[PDB]
C-alpha cells in the first residue's frame, strides 16, 4: 500500500527516511507500507 505524508518540521522528519535521486524522501515500515513524504520542511530540495 501507498501512504503519502507531508513533512512540515524537522520534529515530523523521520530519523530513517530515504531518499532518491529526484529529491523525493520515502520509507518502508516491518508492515510492507510504502510511506511517500513530500518535505516541505526543506524548501531547497
Same mark, same amino acid.
Given at each position: ?17 530515504? *531518499? %532518491? &535521486? #529526484? !529529491? =523525493?524522501?520515502?520509507? *518502508? %515500515? &516491518? #508492515? !510492507? =507500507? ?12
Amino acid at each position: 500500500p501507498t501512504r503519502t505524508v507531508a513533512i512540515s518540521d524537522a520534529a515530523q522528519l523521520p530519523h530513517d527516511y530515504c *531518499t %532518491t &535521486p #529526484g !529529491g =523525493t524522501l520515502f520509507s *518502508t %515500515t &516491518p #508492515g !510492507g =507500507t510504502r510511506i511517500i513524504y513530500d518535505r516541505k520542511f526543506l524548501l531547497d530540495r
